[PDB]
Chains A and B, each alone.
Chain A
Amino acid sequence: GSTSNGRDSESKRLGAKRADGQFVTGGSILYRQRGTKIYPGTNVGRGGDDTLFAKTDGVVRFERMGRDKKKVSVYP
């Protein structure tokens, strides 16, 4: 008797790192993802592995673009 299974990968800790309505400082990571599950908005950049980050100081807002999609912005 043997299983021939038993392997897994380490969890990567994805999801939202800041809250809607929270004040954030420049360069902070807002969201971690595979693909553009959420798009970059105003004053928000997209990293090389799809990480969304703030480019200025301000307050975070999760918003809804056209019907099927979402984005996040930072407003001073």
Chain B
Amino acid sequence: KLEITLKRSLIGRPQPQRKTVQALGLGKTNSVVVKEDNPAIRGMITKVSHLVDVKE
């Protein structure tokens, strides 16, 4: 399991990144989700790694 925190804002970002952040369950900034360690979630994190903090 791993913990995911939205650190940056979505204003000014493209639609694909907003959709990816939506599918991760994250809402407002500084909000947190806890997920599993599938390759699917890792692919999501790779797409938006500049907007988010990941903690094992």
Check A-B contact in the complex, CB < 8 A: no
Interface residues of A (CB under 8 A from B): none
